[PDB]
Design a protein around this ligand. Structure first.
Ligand SMILES: CN(C)[C@H]1CCc2ccccc2C1
Ligand SMILES: [Mg+2]
Ligand SMILES: [Mg+2]
Ligand SMILES: [Mg+2]
Length: 332
């Protein structure tokens, strides 16, 4: 009964079905997903539809990379729904292993499934990419991995943070701007740095990422609250404001809506901004596609989460009385 006012997706990638086939083989081949309950549970998430709705510009092997990257995010995420997420030092050490892969230390044969899957996603991501994209996205991955242990610290504390501290942890553990870096890469575009760092596009990028993680906070609250998770916008608002759950959900909707309004107000300025910078027609085309990538990510993430089984299913198939996975795939 919660709708954030986002438009339905203007399009879906035509590669959904082909990518479903690729990604099913990929998660099994890497050892990221097993057979039986884990495979049925993974399948019920519909990672291919997340990729096709979230990245409608992606075609062919580009959409495959989007789905595999999402597969890594979601499988790796769930490994912390258990003792690992209550052990910050252990989480930090595991995440340092993954961070070493970001910065050039490939894992080698026989690495664990999470290390091997990440290394494959990261190698495919950087192949042929602009060095400015590689440097930025490498730092985005570092933030994602490094933030996990702080979520665990907050779990042990047992109170939500203030809004500023919530944003610092939650933006990291949500994957920071990685979905947009992935969408840019999958669309085959390179945002000119002069446009990328405009105040309008910097604010818009931040707003779009906040929109999707906050939409997720509302839909994933039931499975997260029961596990003692603290970095969820609804819990943060309730704790800060001393309000009811309904009032906190309504306020969370408002945090999303005001960011969508800001994004759309600034998007109106993007044609003029490109003219002021004297960008070439091709540069302007890449900026226009970047705008579409951001718009499609916001609408597509939400379209996916309304139809997936991940959020309605989790409390029943992986109750909070046990770990949030059927198989351990991340050695700690
Ligand atoms: C690590 N989490 C599984 C993240 C992965 C990326 C993402 C992007 C937007 C909204 C929610 C999420 C869940
Ligand atoms: Mg999670
Ligand atoms: Mg998480
Ligand atoms: Mg969530």
């Amino acid at each position: 009964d919660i709708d954030f006012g986002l438009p339905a997706p203007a399009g879906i990638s035509p590669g959904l079905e082909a990518t479903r086939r690729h990604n099913l083989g990929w998660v099994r081949r890497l050892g990221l997903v097993g057979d039986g309950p884990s495979l049925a549970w993974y399948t019920s998430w519909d990672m291919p539809r997340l990729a096709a709705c979230g990245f409608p510009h992606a075609r062919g092997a580009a959409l495959d990379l989007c789905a595999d990257a999402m597969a890594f995010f979601f499988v790796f995420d769930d490994q912390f729904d258990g003792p690992l997420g209550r052990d910050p030092a252990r989480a930090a050490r595991v995440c340092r292993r993954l961070t070493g892969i970001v910065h050039g230390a490939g894992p080698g044969p026989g690495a664990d499934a999470c290390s091997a899957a990440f290394a494959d996603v990261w190698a495919r991501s950087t192949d042929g990419a602009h060095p400015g994209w590689v440097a930025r996205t490498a730092h985005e991955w570092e933030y994602y991995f490094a933030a996990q242990a702080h979520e665990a610290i907050n779990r042990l504390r047992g109170t939500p943070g203030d809004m500023e501290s919530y944003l610092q942890v939650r933006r990291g553990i949500a994957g920071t701007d990685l979905p947009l870096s992935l969408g840019e890469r999958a669309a085959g575009i390179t945002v000119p740095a002069a446009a990328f760092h405009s105040p309008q596009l910097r604010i818009m990028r931040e707003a779009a990422i906040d929109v999707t993680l906050m939409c997720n906070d509302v839909y994933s609250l039931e499975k997260e609250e029961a596990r003692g998770d603290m970095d969820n916008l609804v819990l943060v608002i309730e704790h800060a404001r001393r309000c009811t759950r309904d009032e906190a959900v309504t306020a969370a909707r408002g945090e999303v809506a005001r960011r969508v309004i800001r994004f759309e107000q600034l998007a109106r300025e993007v044609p003029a901004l490109c003219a002021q910078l004297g960008l070439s027609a091709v540069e302007r085309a890449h900026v226009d596609t970047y705008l579409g990538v951001m718009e499609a990510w916001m609408s597509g993430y939400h379209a996916w989460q309304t139809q997936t089984r991940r959020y309605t299913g989790a409390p029943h198939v992986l109750p909070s009385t046990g770990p949030g996975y059927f198989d351990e795939v991340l050695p700690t």
